[PDB]
């Protein structure tokens, strides 16, 4: 979900780590 990763109490670095982890998981789902 983008809500848990777009919180304003999260810095840009942890936001980007959340984005990249979500990207890896959904790329795995795409390959599935």
Q: Residue numbers of the site for other proteins (CB under 8 A)?
A: 2, 6, 11-13, 15-17, 19-20, 22-23, 26-27, 29-30
The distance of closest approach from Cβ of residue 15 to other proteins in the complex, given in angstroms and rounded to an integer, is 5
Residue 5 CB, shortest distance to other proteins, in Å, is 8
Q: How far apart are CA 32 and CA 23, in angstroms?
A: 14
8 A C-beta contact, residue 10 and residue 3:
no
Rounded to a whole number of angstroms, the minimum distance from the CB of residue 16 to other proteins is 5
HSE toward the beta carbon, residue 10, CA cutoff 13 A: 14
């Amino acid at each position: 979900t983008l809500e848990d990763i777009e919180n304003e109490k999260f810095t840009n670095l942890e936001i980007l780590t959340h984005l990249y982890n979500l990207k890896a998981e959904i790329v795995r789902r795409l390959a599935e």
